[PDB]
Amino acid sequence: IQTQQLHAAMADTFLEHMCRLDIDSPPITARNTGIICTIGPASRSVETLKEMIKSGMNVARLNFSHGTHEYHAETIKNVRTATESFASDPILYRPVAVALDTKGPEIRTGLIKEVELKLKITLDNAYMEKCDENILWLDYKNICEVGSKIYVDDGLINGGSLGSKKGVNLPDLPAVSEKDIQDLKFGVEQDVDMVFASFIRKASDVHEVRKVLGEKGKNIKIISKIENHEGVRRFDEILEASDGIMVARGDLGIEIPAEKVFLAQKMMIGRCNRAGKPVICATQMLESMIKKPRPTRAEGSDVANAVLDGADCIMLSGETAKGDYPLEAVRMQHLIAREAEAAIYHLQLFEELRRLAAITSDPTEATAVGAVEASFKCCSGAIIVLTKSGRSAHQVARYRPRAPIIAVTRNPQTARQAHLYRGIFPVLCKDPVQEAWAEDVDLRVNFAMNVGKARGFFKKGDVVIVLTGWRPFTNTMRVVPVP
Amino acid sequence: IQTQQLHAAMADTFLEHMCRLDIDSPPITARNTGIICTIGPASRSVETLKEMIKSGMNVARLNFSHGTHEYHAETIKNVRTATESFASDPILYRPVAVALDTKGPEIRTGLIKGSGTAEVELKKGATLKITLDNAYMEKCDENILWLDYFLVTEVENGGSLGSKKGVNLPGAAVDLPAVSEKDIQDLKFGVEQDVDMVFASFIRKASDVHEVRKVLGEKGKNIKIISKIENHEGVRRFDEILEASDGIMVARGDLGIEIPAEKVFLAQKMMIGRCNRAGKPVICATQMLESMIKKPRPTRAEGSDVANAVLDGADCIMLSGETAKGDYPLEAVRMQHLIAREAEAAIYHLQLFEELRRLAAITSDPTEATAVGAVEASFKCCSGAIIVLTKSGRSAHQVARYRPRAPIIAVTRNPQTARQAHLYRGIFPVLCKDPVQEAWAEDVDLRVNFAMNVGKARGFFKKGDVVIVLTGWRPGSGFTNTMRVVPVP
Amino acid sequence: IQTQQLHAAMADTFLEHMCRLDIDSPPITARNTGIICTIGPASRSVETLKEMIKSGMNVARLNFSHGTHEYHAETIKNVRTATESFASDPILYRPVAVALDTKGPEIRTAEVELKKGATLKITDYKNICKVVEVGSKIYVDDGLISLQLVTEVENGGSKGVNLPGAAVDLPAVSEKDIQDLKFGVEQDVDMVFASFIRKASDVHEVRKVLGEKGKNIKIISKIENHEGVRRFDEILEASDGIMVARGDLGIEIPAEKVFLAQKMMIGRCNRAGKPVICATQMLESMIKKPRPTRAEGSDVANAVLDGADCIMLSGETAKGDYPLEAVRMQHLIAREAEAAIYHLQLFEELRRLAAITSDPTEATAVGAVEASFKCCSGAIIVLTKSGRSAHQVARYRPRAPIIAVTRNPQTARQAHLYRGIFPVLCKDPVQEAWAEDVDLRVNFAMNVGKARGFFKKGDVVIVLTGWRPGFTNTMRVVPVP
Amino acid sequence: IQTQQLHAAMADTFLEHMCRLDIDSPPITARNTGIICTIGPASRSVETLKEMIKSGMNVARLNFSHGTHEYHAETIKNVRTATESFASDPILYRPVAVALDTKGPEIRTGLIKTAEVELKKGATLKITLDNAYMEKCDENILWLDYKNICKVVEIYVDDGLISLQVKQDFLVTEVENGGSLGSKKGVNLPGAAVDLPAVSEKDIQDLKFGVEQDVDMVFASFIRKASDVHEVRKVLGEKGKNIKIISKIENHEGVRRFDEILEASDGIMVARGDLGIEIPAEKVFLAQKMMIGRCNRAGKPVICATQMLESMIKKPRPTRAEGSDVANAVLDGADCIMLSGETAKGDYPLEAVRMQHLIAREAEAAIYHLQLFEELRRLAAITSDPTEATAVGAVEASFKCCSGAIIVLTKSGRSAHQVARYRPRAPIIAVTRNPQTARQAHLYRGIFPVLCKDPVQEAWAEDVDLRVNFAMNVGKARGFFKKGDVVIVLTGWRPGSGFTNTMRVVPVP
Ligand SMILES: O=P(O)(O)OC[C@H]1O[C@](O)(COP(=O)(O)O)[C@@H](O)[C@@H]1O
Ligand SMILES: O=C([O-])C(=O)[O-]
Ligand SMILES: O=C([O-])C(=O)[O-]
Ligand SMILES: O=C([O-])C(=O)[O-]
Ligand SMILES: O=C([O-])C(=O)[O-]
Ligand SMILES: [Mg+2]
Ligand SMILES: [Mg+2]
Ligand SMILES: [Mg+2]
Ligand SMILES: [Mg+2]
Ligand SMILES: [Mg+2]
Ligand SMILES: [Mg+2]
Ligand SMILES: [Mg+2]
Ligand SMILES: [Mg+2]
Ligand SMILES: [Mg+2]
Structure with a gap:
């Protein structure tokens, strides 16, 4: 209550959920x-x-x-x-x-040398860089009503500023x-x-x-x-x-x-x-x-x-x-x-995402939705996900938890691509791979803990959800308290 | 289907309701x-x-x-x-x-060069003197600006400065009346x-x-x-x-x-x-x-x-x-x-009506039960309108609170009621000017037929469509107790 | 709220609705x-x-x-x-x-004592061997005896015959x-x-x-x-x-x-x-x-x-x-x-599963049921000749009783098939003035409801009638006289 | 869809859930x-x-x-x-x-004389507190063991089969319903404030x-x-x-x-x-x-x-x-x-x-789990207890994959109890070395207790696996699931009670 719009989070209806939104309820850091x-x-x-x-x-x-x-x-x-x-x-x-x-397949204009229009549209390439208040070049070859309106610069042009290489739209290019x-x-x-x-x-x-x-x-x-x-x-x-x-x-x-x-x-x-x-x-x-x-x-x-x-x-x-x-x-x-993000009606969102989700025999899919439910039950400070390709983190994000998803990876490309998914906070682990599989799994988990503590995602007394695998396909969920 | 986003209206979930929104689903006229x-x-x-x-x-x-x-x-x-x-x-x-x-309790500026429509272009970093002397009340420009609450300031960002503009002091506890x-x-x-x-x-x-x-x-x-x-x-x-x-x-x-x-x-x-x-x-x-x-x-x-x-x-x-x-x-x-x-066509009426009733109190007001019954009936038959005869507007306001999809054609002889009806979503007020018929039933029909003619001319519905009509049993304000599901004559 | 489990009626969940059921909350008379x-x-x-x-x-x-x-x-x-x-x-x-x-299509057969494990040879359903296979089961006398035509007594004992699963071709x-x-x-x-x-x-x-x-x-x-x-x-x-x-x-x-x-x-x-x-x-x-x-x-x-x-x-x-x-x-x-029904969820689902139709009688019925919940109506009075209007109201399962007034005796008798329809047979002659005939039949429902204790003077009831001197399309929320 | 009433399980309404119940949909074995x-x-x-x-x-x-x-x-x-x-x-x-x-606090009658007497409707029976008739109950007089009886009354005998209506150290009644009156039958005083300990x-x-x-x-x-x-x-x-x-x-x-x-x-x-x-x-x-x-x-x-x-x-x-x-x-x-x-x-x-x-x-297959689990969560409090979060997470996972079982390692039973309260469809195979825990678990819906008797393995992790495989073997033999099915396994990270925080979604070996 009084934080994360949690009073609005418990409303039995979406209407009451709106009614409880409080500008004085501060969001989390994440x-x-x-x-x-x-x-x-x-x-x-x-x-x-x-x-x-x-x-x-x-x-x-x-x-x-x-x-x-x-x-x-x-x-x-x-x-x-x-x-x-x-x-x-x-x-x-x-x-x-x-x-x-x-x-x-964009139709674009040319270079100004922008100018303020309060216009001959040339197709001669000598003005492919000499456009301005009176001259303007176009690149559509298969171009040719008398042609009433032509939209330039996201339909801006009525007078205005006409920049260089602006867009033209006609509401067969490859x-x-x-x-x-x-x-x-x-x-x-x-x-x-x-x-x-x-x-x-x-x-x-x-x-x-x-x-x-x-x-x-x-x-x-x-x-x-x-x-x-x-x-x-x-x-x-x-x-x-x-x-x-x-x-x-x-x-x-x-x-x-x-x-x-x-x-x-x-x-x-x-x-x-x-x-x-x-x-x-x-x-x-x-x-x-x-x-x-x-x-x-x-x-x-x-x-x-x-x-x-x-x-x-x-x-x-x-x-x-x-x-x-x-x-x-x-x-x-x-x-x-x-x-x-704090104003999302997570109660209805999680329900509909689950009801619209298929019954699958994939252990990772069941594990991911289990982690999200658990994170709601304990108002988790984070969901830590160990992943190489990102899939494990993607499967958690699809169920849209309130808590941030800290994806730990040694794959830098996976770390960068993770930004495409709501809630995935990727961290690139640089510690050497431990010869013992469980200890390398654990090693990346403590890494996620330290980032979350340092960034203020959680503090002593909070609870976090940790998703890992069981064999050398992430199928293990651990609920651990933050020290 | 294919109209008023009605495919989205039947979704079992709000997520599916979003998924079904169709840019090729044209809305109603109203x-x-x-x-x-x-x-x-x-x-x-x-x-x-x-x-x-x-x-x-x-x-x-x-x-x-x-x-x-x-x-x-x-x-x-x-x-x-x-x-x-x-x-x-x-x-x-x-x-x-x-x-x-x-x-x-506003802090406002004055006239730029003695004209409300005049404006000036302020540039970033420029100096401006804020004055309280009424000799600049009607003589503000790029250098001087008078206010009704002197201060030498800078321009952290410039722009067009017009006349009678607002001033804000956030975070404080102003004492203006x-x-x-x-x-x-x-x-x-x-x-x-x-x-x-x-x-x-x-x-x-x-x-x-x-x-x-x-x-x-x-x-x-x-x-x-x-x-x-x-x-x-x-x-x-x-x-x-x-x-x-x-x-x-x-x-x-x-x-x-x-x-x-x-x-x-x-x-x-x-x-x-x-x-x-x-x-x-x-x-x-x-x-x-x-x-x-x-x-x-x-x-x-x-x-x-x-x-x-x-x-x-x-x-x-x-x-x-x-x-x-x-x-x-x-x-x-x-x-x-x-x-x-x-x-308006994209509203998830299924969930909205659902919560509006559940959050609404059980009352002994016949007009309230009649209004929510009219909205339910309008949903059941996808009515073209809810026609409401109202003198004070109250009957029409009670229908609008339950947010029907169909427009609410409020018929009144009260011009002030007609104008104030615009404050409520969905109330389309029509000002009837015909003389009051001495027979109440014939006066009711006269006003219902007036809404009918407006609805037809406006393209809200045509003859043979179905509309909900809210009327009273006695002349005056407070007796709205009759709901009719009638075909358009 | 202490009556008809109305506290339970306001629960946001069916679990809470169960938790609020009160043996000390008396039901209505109807x-x-x-x-x-x-x-x-x-x-x-x-x-x-x-x-x-x-x-x-x-x-x-x-x-x-x-x-x-x-x-x-x-x-x-x-x-x-x-x-x-x-x-x-x-x-x-x-x-x-x-x-x-x-x-x-019933299959029928002092007394004899059947023993478990004994064999029985079947020798009035002349076509049974064509509808049961080797291993099919046969039940005699309200399922008392069970047999497995050379049958084996699976359940013995000392009439009607049932062939479970079998596709009986009797007329x-x-x-x-x-x-x-x-x-x-x-x-x-x-x-x-x-x-x-x-x-x-x-x-x-x-x-x-x-x-x-x-x-x-x-x-x-x-x-x-x-x-x-x-x-x-x-x-x-x-x-x-x-x-x-x-x-x-x-x-x-x-x-x-x-x-x-x-x-x-x-x-x-x-x-x-x-x-x-x-x-x-x-x-x-x-x-x-x-x-x-x-x-x-x-x-x-x-x-x-x-x-x-x-x-x-x-x-x-x-x-x-x-x-x-x-x-x-x-x-x-x-x-x-009936008082323990979770009307909140029931009415919600019945509407969502109901088709959007241009039928005025359907819209009137669900509107009357919605209005009856809003004002805790004492009854929904329906004037009906065939029963159709009253049946359409009952399908939306209102809490209040549905007083169907008819002059058709068969309509009155058959109305009992629908939950909540309390039929009353009006026998007064048809009045030449249409409105007075409606009022006469509504007041009859008024008097019946008062005498039975469904409501009293000053309570609120819903009345369903027609508007011109052939379909029920008019809903009135009136106080009981 | 054709088993465990799974078509009915996916209905968007409870009404449709009823409409989809299928007598030809066989339930699970458990x-x-x-x-x-x-x-x-x-x-x-x-x-x-x-x-x-x-x-x-x-x-x-x-x-x-x-x-x-x-x-x-x-x-x-x-x-x-x-x-x-x-x-x-x-x-x-x-x-x-x-x-x-x-x-x-039971009130029982006296002795008649398998002797019984026939009480007749409309007839009269006298209730007595005199111990002289404690073993002389007949068609007219009847003794009971309640000291302050005539005070808290202004009567039902033998599981309510016989009902009496009082008309007055004694009491005179009229038999409202007739039947046979044996010895030490039970008596009910409905509503009356009984002061028995x-x-x-x-x-x-x-x-x-x-x-x-x-x-x-x-x-x-x-x-x-x-x-x-x-x-x-x-x-x-x-x-x-x-x-x-x-x-x-x-x-x-x-x-x-x-x-x-x-x-x-x-x-x-x-x-x-x-x-x-x-x-x-x-x-x-x-x-x-x-x-x-x-x-x-x-x-x-x-x-x-x-x-x-x-x-x-x-x-x-x-x-x-x-x-x-x-x-x-x-x-x-x-x-x-x-x-x-x-x-x-x-x-x-x-x-x-x-x-x-x-x-x-x-x-059990006809329960509308969609609504039940949903409401159980909404009515459940947000707690910082890891065992509670683990339990509801395991049940959610069990619905997602229609798990063959939820295997729970527990010494006191608590971990298994917390899972049952969220009412999963799958059975809860509680593995314990505590026989009392095994017997008391029967009180909870869905907990199938199995009493492990193997010696404690020297490696704790291997002792955990031993008990999980025991549950696997029990599930295989009882026909709850087979090799290749998916089960949820609940264990702890440390020995002893109160550390159950680990959920594994594993294929049956
Ligand atoms: O339900 P309880 O009584 O908390 O028992 C659960 C405990 O069983 C375990 O899973 C393993 O059992 P042991 O403690 O006997 O080794 C513990 O990790 C866990 O804390
Ligand atoms: O190209 C774009 O990003 C656009 O058109 O918005
Ligand atoms: O007055 C207003 O409309 C405002 O301040 O936005
Ligand atoms: O015939 C019947 O009514 C039956 O079998 O229940
Ligand atoms: O004692 C009992 O079990 C009872 O009364 O049902
Ligand atoms: Mg673009
Ligand atoms: Mg203003
Ligand atoms: Mg303002
Ligand atoms: Mg029969
Ligand atoms: Mg028969
Ligand atoms: Mg007949
Ligand atoms: Mg008790
Ligand atoms: Mg006992
Ligand atoms: Mg007992």
């Missing part, structure tokens, strides 16, 4: 929702990236709609330089994933282009952790991305970005082929009526939760913070409601890439997400 | 959420007000934080002039409420102008609500008092404030500065839930479509904000600068209309 | 579960039948497995003589239905079934209990016998064997109602499984809104004792909690020594169990 | 509801008791309302002789508990005798208040501090004071016989469902007793009402069901035990 940040001129710097990690960044998203492979290579180097500067203290080290966002082929091949070379595939329209599109990543990138998680009507209508087949989903609201809000976007968002988040696959809510969550240090009330509400919807990650696309207040934007998402 | 629009330079004209009414406006909010009584009088005149221009056709006539928003002398005058002016409701700013306690009611006196005893919760004290004392008030406004603008911005959604959802639980109107207000002040399309967060407020259970949604001073007031009104309809 | 009594030598007299009506009897069951048409004709005469002796006072008159229980209607059924049409019975219904085609054959003259006679299919349970859905769709004939069912299927079939059929009938009867041995010990056993009290109560519209008495009233007490016991327990 | 049998002339023999164990008996109930200490001692000897004759095979051995049922001198004598004979539990008759339970515990003292005290709720006061009685007791018995005389018979089902619900809510054992299969005293098959009564008691949530005359004096004791076993198994 924050479950992963934060993805688009890197750009305002945040490419190593000094900024270090502070962005401390502010809550978990995934660095690189939009390959602009920039050369050389440019992104230096960005990744800076990201990894900032990340590895905390490796001197493995208790406080934070794994940071690198995400590749494809250009996709799913993956050769330029796309290159970027993922480059992403495989740079050992990125995940791929954000733009404008995925069908399941065949997802299979093409996987073939390109091939055996070399077989562990690269493919997150399909639903940005248009076709993606929504074929969502089920896209989700089955993908490792996760991004609700790309920017383009989606242009391709489909703006008043329907919340329907598509809640549909995809629900189905991803139902499938136990990660879902990302993206774009314009804190749009005004590009120029202002404080978000609007609608922006604060959007982030909170995305977490309440069940989103695994929330994104900043330009608030961190080019805005004037990148650190504040990340901190705001951290603050809002933590408050919203 | 829109249940009331729309309140702040009137200002962008919307004072009769021509604009005419288009704002057609675009979906139900309540006109006049902020007395700025402007003279003379100025506001012409605003009310224009609102009523635009409203009465549709009175030549009572089938499509739309009652429009007038709302008075008090200044309250709940009702000021200026508030008393504005409140008396509102009683004289026959406004329908008062939005009382910065209500911190129940004593505040009672003082506003005393000023409204006997002449304004029927003026609805909506307490604006804008600060820490208002949230902590919400139950006693709600008990004293006729309704509640989540005034997120000031609330988002007074309390941490990341906590505002908690206070919003708490208050909407408690008003829903109490059956009193609740308004979600401010910055819902802020970007539409300068842009013709809202941001994705703003579209989400309106939808979720409706899903939260808000009776009304508000527009401030988007309609008072923005460049796209009609589009902002139309955007709220479009989103509200979509979100 | 009793909702219909009571069906088999009439026989112990209850045939006019004087006894009068006391049985006063004690709660709603339906008189005549088992045509025994007795001649002459005998049953005199039984019906006595039932109607006792019933009609209260007709001089329509406030205290109780419509009493007459039910014909068919012999059906649905026998020649004497046709004659008995035709006799029932001649005697103007209200309902038929069709024994050993195995498939939907069986129900259609019974309906064929009743013809146009008995087109309004309700057919209650008796589920008595494995095939009937396995084909229940098609049987229920074809029938007007269902009887859980536990006597024979307990022989045809393992006795430990009978409760599964009972709760299955009651649930499915509740889901369809069709009457269901729980029958046989409910108070069996009261044949010889004036008080029931604890198991028998529990059986009656749990049948009501299951959702059965009626409970039945067989030997307890046909041949036992305490028929009045057996009827009174069922009346008392049913009332206690 | 039977969770404990069976208590009253021992008497029909069942005292070692040979009969042997068959009673094989037919399903878990608890032998000895009614000390009759019989000498010598008599009951020989019954206990036969029970243990019959029980230990299966110890030659520890895989199939079944621990059998011995339960002492007290006489309590909770524990009598005879009760103290029997209770001390039970400690000497090492009984596992006491069925305390006519518990009216918590002070009564406390008096029973005082008599049992430190020597019998581990004897479970089961309070029998048989009267109005016990129901009204149930919460305080339940708090003081180890369990509760719904003694429907006397309760059905003390309160109106039509209300007994209310008191049954209240007490079972509250015992389920408190996590303490509850027994449904008396007349469950009454007709089987003379008949080899039960009535349809009796079969329903057994099933519905299990559906209510009763941990154990009881037989009284059906096994003590009836002609078909074996069949009565077999029928209860059969019905209970069928009813």
